[PDB]
């Protein structure tokens, strides 16, 4: 069982499998190691292969993982690392910032932008408040929250170049989104808190 | 009641049933800013990778392939042609001299002895073919820079032209680096300028020489082409 750690790791992997990509076969390699939790981790909760054209709901997954972790009194906040190894582009989900630092470790920890050329041996590092920083100059103050503006990452993988296109999705039928939010609020209100 | 809807309430309600979270993700379906305005002149090389060009006389915009209505309604697969290798396509449709006549006509009309310099650069034909494939009949023009390398001006016949994503990919990826690609408009219509990257890079070669000169046999120049090419050469000289 080892439910304190094992059950949490399983739930997080299930979240990532269920909500990351809305459709298609998700090539995910799960980790079966307690080193996930140990500080200075070099091993991920899960590693997800990225396919050209598919949309990956990054921000929703990230904020959901942060919620689950804070519910379990885990101090650290997660970190996503999208990297090009030369053969394929991989999204690795580390619960805490790894040891691969900005100081000449690989290709610079490229920041967020509308379009990011991701050459071989290069990485993109997404943290806690990077999503809000990226969305700030693109939406009005009321829309900054995830409930109304979601960040997503599309992959443009071609043999001649691989690029990551970060986009911001909103709801067209605001009324229907409001109804779904009403359903979620009802479910939350019914469930018992501590 | 409805107030106080913390992110925690949202994520808890979802943790109850993942299907509600899927519903939320489904409703958030429209990107925020697909279309980006762009003004001429534009260096196509220094451009983001996947983008269509919806150029029009009043405005000139750049959108994404995923959400380009014209590129979506039409067969998105369309017709994948094997133009992948510059040299492959060069020696594939140099044989089709009955087509591509306008290209040979323009270079021959110049006959500056730089017809050799047009033949030396196979990149040129590549551009023409692809611009003809995805974006209809082109009108080629050849001018002489201070550099021995001739510059090319392929003119496109269109009030509102839709340069697809695949075309820009092919051009920039296979020819881009070797030759500066740019877009601007002359009086009558928009054009794509193919240029040598200063003198920093000269690449590739072949020499058919008189084999092609005997071949051209100075085919007839239609008066429609004659007027268009003459006026466009004059207007280029005015620039
Ligand atoms: Zn298009």
Residue numbers in the entry:
A (entry chain A): 1 to 194
B (entry chain B): 78 to 316
The paper states:
During replication, herpesviral capsids are translocated from the nucleus into the cytoplasm by an unusual mechanism, termed nuclear egress, that involves capsid budding at the inner nuclear membrane. Capsid budding at the INM requires the viral nuclear egress complex (NEC), a heterodimer of two conserved viral proteins: UL31, a soluble nuclear phosphoprotein, and UL34, which contains a single C-terminal transmembrane (TM) helix that anchors the NEC in the INM. Here, we report the crystal structure of the NEC from Epstein-Barr virus (EBV), a prototypical gammaherpesvirus. Here, we show that the purified, recombinant EBV NEC vesiculates synthetic lipid membranes in vitro and forms membrane-bound coats, which suggests that the intrinsic membrane budding ability is a conserved property of the NECs across Herpesviridae.
For crystallization, we designed a construct EBV NEC195Δ65 composed of residues 1–195 of BFRF1 and residues 66–318 of BFLF2, which is similar to those of previously crystallized NEC homologs. This construct lacks the membrane-proximal regions (MPRs) in both BFRF1 and BFLF2 as well as the TM anchor of BFRF1. The structure was refined to 3.97 Å resolution (Rwork = 27.0%, Rfree = 30.8%). Like its counterparts in alpha- and betaherpesviruses, the EBV NEC resembles an elongated cylinder that is composed of the globular BFRF1 pedestal topped with the globular C-terminal domain of BFLF2 and the N-terminal two-helix “hook” of BFLF2 that wraps around the BFRF1 pedestal. The conserved CCCH-type Zn-binding site, formed by three cysteines and one histidine, is located at the base of the globular domain. Importantly, EBV NEC crystals contain five independent, structurally distinct heterodimers in the asymmetric unit. The structural differences among the 5 EBV NEC heterodimers, notably within BFLF2 and at the BFLF2/BFRF1 interface, for the first time experimentally demonstrate conformational dynamics within the EBV NEC. BFLF2 interacts with BFRF1 at two interfaces, the so-called “primary” or hook-in-groove interface that involves the BFLF2 hook, and the “secondary” or globular interface, which involves the globular domain of BFLF2. Across the five EBV NEC heterodimers, the globular domains of BFLF2 adopt distinct orientations relative to BFRF1 where they are either more or less tilted towards the BFRF1/hook module, as measured by the angles between D10BFRF1/P98BFRF1/D287BFLF2. We attribute the differences in tilt across the EBV NEC heterodimers to the differences in the interactions at the globular domain interface, specifically, the presence or the absence of the distal hydrogen bond between T158BFRF1 and E250BFLF2.
